[PDB]
Paper text:
Class A plexins (PlxnAs) act as semaphorin receptors and control diverse aspects of nervous system development and plasticity, ranging from axon guidance and neuron migration to synaptic organization. Plexins are large type 1 transmembrane proteins comprising typically ten domains in their extracellular segment, a single membrane spanning region that is predicted to be helical and a conserved, cytoplasmic region that contains a GTPase-activating protein (GAP) domain with a Rho GTPase-binding domain insert. All our PlxnA ectodomain structures show autoinhibitory, intermolecular “head-to-stalk” (domain 1 to domain 4-5) interactions, which are confirmed by biophysical assays, live cell fluorescence microscopy, and cell-based and neuronal growth cone collapse assays. This work reveals a 2-fold role of the PlxnA ectodomains: imposing a pre-signaling autoinhibitory separation for the cytoplasmic domains via intermolecular head-to-stalk interactions and supporting dimerization-based PlxnA activation upon ligand binding.
All our PlxnA full ectodomain crystal structures have an intermolecular plexin–plexin interface in common. This interface is formed by blades 1–3 of the sema domain of one plexin molecule and the outer side of domains 4-5 (PSI2-IPT2) from the ring of a second plexin. The residues in this interface are conserved among vertebrate PlxnAs but much less among all plexins, suggesting that this plexin–plexin interaction may be an important functional feature of PlxnAs. We engineered two separate segments consisting of the PlxnA2 sema-PSI1 domains (PlxnA21-2) and the PSI2-IPT2 domains (PlxnA24-5); each segment encompasses one side of the putative “head-to-stalk” intermolecular interface. We found that PlxnA21-2 and PlxnA24-5 associated with an equilibrium dissociation constant (Kd) of 20.9 ± 0.38 μM. Taken together, the results of our in solution assays point to a head-to-stalk mode of interaction between receptor ectodomains that is common to all PlxnAs.
Author numbering: 653 to 803
The structure:
Amino acid sequence: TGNCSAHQLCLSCVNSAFRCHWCKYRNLCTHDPTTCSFQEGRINVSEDCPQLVPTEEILIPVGEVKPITLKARNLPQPQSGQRGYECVLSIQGAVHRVPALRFNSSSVQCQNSSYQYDGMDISNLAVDFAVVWNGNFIIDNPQDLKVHLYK
Ligand SMILES: *[C@@H]1O[C@H](CO)[C@@H](O)[C@H](O)[C@H]1NC(C)=O
Ligand SMILES: *[C@@H]1O[C@H](CO)[C@@H](O)[C@H](O)[C@H]1NC(C)=O
Ligand SMILES: *[C@@H]1O[C@H](CO)[C@@H](O)[C@H](O)[C@H]1NC(C)=O
Ligand SMILES: [Cl-]
Ligand code: NA
Ligand code: NA
C-alpha cells in the first residue's frame, strides 16, 4: 500500500506494487481509474505506456539545420487546449526547447533547428533530452536514449 500519486511517469506507475493506473491525458498516477479523464486514458500495463523505443545512435551534425526523428509507442494525442510536443535538450548545462510534431502514435520529430557545443576535442557529445507535451508531460525514455551532436 502507498500513494500511487507519488509515481511521476507511466512506467513507474503501472509497475507499482501499490496497484496503480496511469492517466495519460491528466499525466498522473492513481489508485482509482475513474480519476482519469475517460476510459481510453487509463493505462494499466507497461507496454501501453507512452515511451521512446530503442534506436540506433541519434547523430546530428553541429551547425546544420536538422530535425530529430524519434521512434516511440503510444504517444498521446493532445486534448482540446492542451499544448503539443517539444524536445527539451540539456547541452552542457543549458536548456534548449525545440518545437516538435507528433506524426502518429509511434513517431515524434523535433523540428528543424541547428545545434552547437563547446569543445574542439569532443567529436561526439552525448546530450540529455526529453520529449514533452503540454509543457511538462514527459514521455518515458526507459532505454536512456541520448542525442549525439558531432563535429
Ligand atoms: C495519498 O493517499 C490518500 C488515500 O489513501 C489520500 O487521502 C491523499 O490525498 C493522498 N495524497 C496525495 C498527496 O496524493
Ligand atoms: C529543414 O531545413 C532544411 C535546411 O535548411 C531545408 O532544406 C528544409 O526544407 C527544411 N524543412 C522543413 C520542413 O522546413
Ligand atoms: C508515423 O509517421 C512517420 C513520419 O511521417 C511515418 O514514417 C510512419 O510510417 C508513421 N507510422 C504509422 C504507423 O503511420
Ligand atoms: Cl486521462
Ligand atoms: Na502523459
Ligand atoms: Na527509451
